[PDB]
Design a binder for this molecule. Structure first.
Ligand SMILES: NC(=[NH2+])NCCC[C@H](N)C(=O)O
Ligand code: NA
Ligand code: NA
Ligand code: NA
Ligand SMILES: [Zn+2]
Length: 866
């Protein structure tokens, strides 16, 4: 297919102000009548190009005049000779039952529902499918009352009727103009959880949460979470919900997570449903995160939307930032910060190195679901966070205020947002704008000198961004670089120069520069890049003792955890090299001693302890190497675990029992203590086998909740303890009728360290709870294998690659978006060694060859093969 470029953006030749939709719903054959009020801004010779895909056009009228001047060409309806103002009427047919791709209107079990972001509304009718066209929607739905008793669209019920033949209809009116990507329609039968929330200003909002019949007991957390989101957006941003009613529909068949359709959010049911014995702490906190996320979109995405899709980060960067702040306010900010950094370093960095590398504001896009990426979302959020870091909270809020004042009700650009922050704060961000247009992860090298004569510390900070596949030119960024200097007592040395204080966030704006600090009264141990103040790789020659010092003394828990990650980083790289030579793990006693200290520190926050005692993921570890040896990394992680499990056996067991809790609560102290207890159990699993098998079996069976049961189940798989198969069989026998609970089991299987792991995953394509028609199952099994089990995917015989190629051959026709998610491990071939590349290249060349290759895959494959 054909590529699209940000720099060609042009205001449209026509606009639409108002659209009245009617749907005659039926799964096999739905008929759509779309009456649109339109305007020509452009020139008379220039026709209206409307977008449409897989549409059966029944009729076209202009002001009730059957129109003759038009043609369907590929993917568009082109209409000529139009008035300056006219009523467009289209009628067309679509078939939700045939919609396996889950774009547009499709069927999720017995229900019908929509996904229109990014360019899905064109699968529903011929429209100006672009988010710079905003209009007021009115939506009429006609359906069989028995199959589809509930008929939902955005806004308010303004009309209702019954009909002959057991059909009924309902009409919705959304007062706020919107881009079609925000349109939603759900029809079906549901249990409905109903509550209300009153805004600070007195507006009473009806809350309706629609779940499949029988799931009303799993709904209350999500509700509480919505209410908390509404409260928090009020307290922190001063923003209030703007309609009378808030609907959420949880459906099972969904490609991504959730969607912010105005007043009618549609969620993957994985981020709604929870109960203490089906969902984990992580699940609860994810439900909290995503409910919040889609709610915060109501202002940052909906009241202010994107001028075009290249501006996607304008809303996702900002909205993610907002869900991070939400979770951090209500929970542990540090645990939150830590995990978000794990993700930046572990996954996003890898993408910014990949052939799919792109700035948070892309300049070129072929298929736009491919840019719903770790980069646009998470790095985009770090970019927001840097603006926040640079302006401080009060000015950051003044900028938010200016942004809405300026742009409420319209579509905007990333640049509009930066300008609003600049103008409201009077901090200059012209240079800082380069973060929007430059891909790749900058590397920051730091050098230091203490001079005792002058009591001066000197930092020489230099930066480079290496070239990426997408960009041959790179240039210095405006890098906000936070530091603290500690003296030998653990106290903080006040930063200064020439008598007057110095803000501890340095403006690193050049390829190379120097900072001097006066009155540094003792040779300092520095904390560098505090709080991960910019999304960069830091190069500084730490000593173990500097790092252990910081683990004991740094003010911010983040810097303690992070020091530990640097300490470990070194010994991971040592042992991968060793593993390649056939040598066992080697590890200095003082390294093990540092972690013993964390286990016995009575004062440390268990949440922090637990993160420090969590080894980097294999994905995090991979980022330490130019060439990746996935097997060595996997085996080294296993050995590092085994070793600490031996060295710290008694302390690990002590802390495990000490954190026992008879009561289960989703509450941040209880989650911390539990996260610690399970971190310990993990190590103990790799210790002496009989005690392991006993502790792990006991917790599986005695557990009063899914967090504890799964941690044990998961440890049995990881450590291949003798009780494993029994426990796995039992989870199957209990939970097999339950998709979302099974997803956890499929993930364990797909990630098992056993040697017959691929053979098992194939068998599981037949399992009773698996099916290729459900993205969630696909990702629990196939995805978790290919992306979260690198050792097996990258098995030397190329067997992992051929497996994924089979699956992708299916998925390319069935569901290109899911296929594109799954290909990603394969387009990383250049991080690996030559023999693996050659096989991976071949695998890609084969997929390139598929008859009817999707745009979604073509994009990644051609870049990967370039
Ligand atoms: N087809 C899709 N799932 N597109 C992406 C929708 C993601 C949604 N806007 C979110 O940020 O949560
Ligand atoms: Na408009
Ligand atoms: Na609110
Ligand atoms: Na907090
Ligand atoms: Zn979002």
């Amino acid at each position: 297919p054909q590529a699209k470029y940000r720099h060609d953006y042009r205001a449209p030749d026509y606009q639409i102000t108002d659209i009245d939709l009617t749907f005659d719903l039926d799964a096999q054959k739905t008929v759509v009548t779309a009456v649109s009020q339109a305007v020509r801004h452009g020139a008379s010779d220039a026709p209206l190009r409307l977008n449409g895909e897989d549409l059966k056009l029944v009729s076209v009228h202009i002001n009730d005049e059957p129109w003759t001047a038009w043609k369907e060409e590929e993917g568009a309806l082109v209409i000529s000779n139009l008035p300056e103002r006219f009523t467009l009427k289209i009628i067309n047919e679509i078939s939700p039952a045939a919609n396996t791709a889950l774009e547009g209107l499709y069927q999720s079990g017995d229900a019908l529902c929509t996904q229109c972001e990014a360019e899905g509304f064109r699968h529903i009718t011929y429209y100006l499918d672009r988010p710079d066209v905003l209009a007021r929607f009115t939506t009429k739905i006609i359906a069989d009352k028995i199959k589809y008793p509930f008929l939902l669209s955005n806004g308010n019920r303004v009309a209702q009727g019954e009909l002959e033949n057991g059909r009924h209809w309902v009409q919705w009116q959304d007062p706020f103009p919107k881009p079609c990507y925000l349109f939603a329609l759900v029809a079906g039968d549901f249990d409905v959880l109903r509550d209300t929330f009153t805004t600070r200003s007195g507006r009473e909002v009806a809350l309706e949460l629609y779940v499949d019949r029988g799931n009303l007991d799993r709904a209350p957390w999500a509700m509480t979470s919505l209410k908390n989101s509404m409260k928090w957006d009020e307290e922190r941003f001063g923003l209030e919900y703007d309609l009378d009613i808030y609907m959420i529909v949880a459906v099972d068949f969904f490609n991504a997570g959730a969607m912010e359709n105005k007043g009618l959010n549609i969620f993957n049911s994985k981020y709604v449903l929870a109960r203490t014995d089906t969902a984990t702490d992580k699940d609860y906190l994810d439900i909290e995160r995503v409910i919040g996320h889609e709610y915060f979109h109501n202002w940052t995405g909906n009241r202010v939307t994107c001028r075009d899709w290249f501006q996607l980060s304008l809303k996702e960067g900002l909205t993610v930032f907002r869900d991070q702040e939400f979770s951090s306010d209500l929970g542990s900010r540090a645990v939150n910060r830590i995990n978000n950094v794990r993700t930046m370093r572990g996954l996003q960095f890898a993408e910014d190195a990949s052939p799919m590398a792109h700035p948070i504001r892309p300049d070129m896009v072929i298929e736009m679901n491919n840019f719903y990426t770790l980069t646009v979302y998470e790095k985009g959020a770090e970019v927001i966070r840097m603006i926040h870091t640079l302006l401080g909270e009060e000015n950051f809020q003044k900028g938010m205020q200016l942004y809405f004042e300026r742009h409420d009700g319209s579509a905007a650009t990333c640049d509009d947002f930066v300008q609003a922050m600049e103008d409201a704060s009077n901090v200059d961000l012209s240079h800082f704008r380069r973060w929007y247009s430059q891909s790749g992860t900058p590397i920051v090298t730091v050098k230091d000198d203490y001079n005792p004569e002058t009591e001066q510390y000197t930092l020489t900070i230099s930066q480079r961004t290496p070239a990426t596949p997408d960009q041959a030119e790179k240039q210095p960024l405006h890098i906000p670089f936070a530091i603290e200097l500690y003296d030998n007592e653990g106290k903080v040395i006040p930063l200064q120069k020439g008598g007057h204080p110095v803000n501890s966030v340095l403006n690193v704006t050049q390829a190379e520069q120097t900072f001097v600090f006066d009155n540094v009264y003792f040779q300092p141990v520095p904390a560098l890049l505090c709080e991960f103040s910019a999304p960069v790789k830091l190069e500084y020659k730490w000593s173990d003792q500097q790092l252990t010092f910081l683990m004991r003394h740094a003010r911010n828990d983040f810097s303690r955890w992070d020091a530990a990650q640097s300490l470990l980083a070194t010994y991971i790289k040592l042992n991968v090299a060793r593993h390649q030579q056939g040598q066992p793990l080697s590890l200095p006693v003082h390294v093990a001693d540092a972690f013993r200290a964390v286990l016995l520190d009575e004062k440390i926050d268990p949440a922090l302890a637990a993160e420090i005692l969590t080894l980097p993921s294999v994905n995090e570890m991979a980022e330490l190497f130019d060439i990746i040896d996935p097997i060595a990394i996997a085996e080294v992680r296993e050995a590092l675990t085994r070793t600490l499990a031996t060295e710290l056996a008694d302390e690990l067991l002590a802390i495990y029992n000490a954190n026992y809790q008879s009561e289960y609560r989703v509450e941040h102290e209880d989650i911390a203590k539990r996260t610690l207890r399970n971190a310990c159990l993990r190590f103990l699993a790799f210790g002496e086998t009989h005690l392991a098998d006993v502790l792990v079996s006991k917790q599986f069976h005695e557990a009063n909740n899914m967090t504890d049961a799964l941690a044990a189940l998961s440890a049995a798989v990881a450590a291949q303890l003798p009780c494993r198969d029994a426990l796995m069989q039992e989870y199957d026998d209990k939970w097999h009728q339950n998709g979302l609970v099974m997803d956890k089991w499929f993930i364990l299987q797909a990630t098992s360290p056993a040697a017959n792991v691929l053979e098992t995953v194939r068998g599981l394509l037949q399992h009773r709870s698996f099916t290729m028609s459900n993205p969630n199952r696909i990702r629990s099994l196939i995805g978790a294998f290919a992306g979260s089990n690198p050792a097996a995917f990258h098995a030397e015989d190329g067997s992992g690659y051929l497996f994924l190629v089979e699956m992708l051959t299916d998925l390319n026709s069935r569901n290109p978006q899911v296929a594109s998610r799954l290909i990603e491990p394969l387009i990383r071939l250049k991080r690996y060694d030559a023999k693996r590349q050659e096989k991976m290249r071949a695998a890609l060349e084969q997929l390139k060859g598929l008859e009817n290759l999707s745009g979604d895959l073509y994009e990644k494959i051609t870049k990967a093969l370039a």
